[PDB]
Amino acid sequence: SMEQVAMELRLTELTRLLRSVLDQLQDKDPARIFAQPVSLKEVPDYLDHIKHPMDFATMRKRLEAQGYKNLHEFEEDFDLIIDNCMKYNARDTVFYRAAVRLRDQGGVVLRQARREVDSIG
């Protein structure tokens, strides 16, 4: 149907906008702390601590399959990156501090992304 096509075009355009958002958020992680999944070979207990691991590469795979239906879903995964790190790592660590700085900086980006998603529809 044409209606199904129009919905698919909207999803495609959302995917475009979320790719630009993802790029901008990942630039706020110049250390690349959040680039890849935590390795279960290197942190064998991780899944005892963190139930839903998340990282920028895993987000990018979902994005490229057009797997985010709305900005809320994308934000959920970004918040998991931050929140997982702030739980597993202590306040005095480079990891935790990197997560705080990512959250603070990413807030700016996400605030305008929401306006754009609402504005363009």
- Resolution of this entry, Å: 1.7
**Which residue segment(s) compose the domain that 118 sits in?**
1-121
Residue with token string 């979902």 = 62
What separation, in Å, do the N-terminal and C-terminal C-alpha atoms of the chain show? 21
Number of folded domains in the chain? 1
Looking up residue 67, the CATH number of its domain turns out to be 1.20.920.10
**C-beta separation of 56 from 19 below 8 A:** no
Length of the chain: 121
Radius of gyration of the chain (CA): 16
Spell out the residues 6+ positions from residue 110 whose beta carbon is closer than 8 angstroms to its own.
21, 25, 75, 78
Q: What was the experiment behind these coordinates?
A: X-ray
- How many angstroms separate the Cα of 5 from the Cα of each of 8, 10, 63, 78, 121? 5, 9, 19, 29, 16
3-class SS letters over the chain: CHHHHHHHHHHHHHHHHHHHHHHHHHHCCCCCCCCCCCCCCCCCCHHHHCCCCCCHHHHHHHHHCCCCCCHHHHHHHHHHHHHHHHHHCCCCCHHHHHHHHHHHHHHHHHHHHHHHHHHHC
- How many angstroms separate the Cα of 29 from the Cα of each of 10, 15, 65, 67? 29, 21, 24, 23
